[PDB]
């Protein structure tokens, strides 16, 4: 299975009430392993997973130092953008940054990313070739010319195809029992009587990892996409995820519906039926 490593950064300006809030988190696939909170007392990068705790002090002092530097960058960016858009110093704005790499099942570099957003909208992003940029608007183009002129893309390329993939591999290795595991979902159905001539059939998939999963309903082998109530995959709080798909079934028709669960943790897809 292919994997990925990603770092997410959120910086929020609090006009008249201190420095902006800066939150940074790192992930390997769907498992968080580090975090940083500018409002936290420690002021250090902290571990959020078992397999990273065994990194020595050098690692923690290094990432803390670099995360603090990231924080400082987003602190200056907020002001730059505030001016690029001629905005009041009273309003609260948000800048987001995301960068990382994906490797194939062969653990080799597949693609790299480095995107940036302002108040929820794309601002600038590195293109797949890792040499050109996608400037959202007019303000974004000023940054693009400056990153072009400074040869920013070239440096990110070195990081995304080198360090990023190398540490991803190291992490995948150090956390084998975790990151390289495949937790099949626990499944079941619930039957609730809507009224007299109908009932809601809900298909459950629980305690599964990674998050990716496909849960669909069928009537006589026909896809019920449009008639399926499908929720957003949520976290259990213990590293596993949960999800459900439901449909309304006319009386005496439970036999016609099948629930199909596709997940990497399954030896073969599952076909559940109320019975």
């Amino acid at each position: 299975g292919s994997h990925s490593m990603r770092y997410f950064f959120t910086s929020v300006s609090r006009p008249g009430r201190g420095e902006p809030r800066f939150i940074a988190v790192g992930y390997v696939d769907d498992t968080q392993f580090v975090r940083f909170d500018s409002d936290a007392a420690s002021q250090r990068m902290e571990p959020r997973a078992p397999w990273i705790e065994q990194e020595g002090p050098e690692y923690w002092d290094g990432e803390t130092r670099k995360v603090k530097a990231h924080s400082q960058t987003h602190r200056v960016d907020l002001g730059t953008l505030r001016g690029y858009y001629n905005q009041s110093e009273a309003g609260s704005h948000t800048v987001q940054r995301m960068y990382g790499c994906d490797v194939g099942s062969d653990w080799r570099f597949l693609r790299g990313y480095h995107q940036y957003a302002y108040d929820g909208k794309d601002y600038i992003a590195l293109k797949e070739d890792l040499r050109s940029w996608t400037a959202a608007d007019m303000a974004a183009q000023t940054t693009k010319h400056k990153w072009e002129a400074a040869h920013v893309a070239e440096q990110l390329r070195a990081y995304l195809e080198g360090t990023c993939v190398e540490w991803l591999r190291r992490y995948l290795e150090n956390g084998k029992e975790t990151l390289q595991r495949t937790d099949a979902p626990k499944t079941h159905m619930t039957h609730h009587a809507v009224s007299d001539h109908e009932a809601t059939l809900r298909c459950w998939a629980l305690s599964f990892y990674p998050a990716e999963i496909t849960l669909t309903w069928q009537r006589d082998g026909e896809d019920q996409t449009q008639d399926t109530e499908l929720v957003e995959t949520r976290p259990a709080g213990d590293g596993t995820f949960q999800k459900w798909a439901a449909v309304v079934v006319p009386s005496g028709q439970e036999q016609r519906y099948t629930c199909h669960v596709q997940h990497e943790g399954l030896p073969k897809p599952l076909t559940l039926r109320w019975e």
Binding site: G62, A69, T73, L81, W147, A150
Partner: peptide, 9 residues
């Protein structure tokens, strides 16, 4: 690990 270079806009 983090990228060692975080240029500013």
């Amino acid at each position: 690990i983090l990228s060692a270079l975080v240029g500013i806009l």
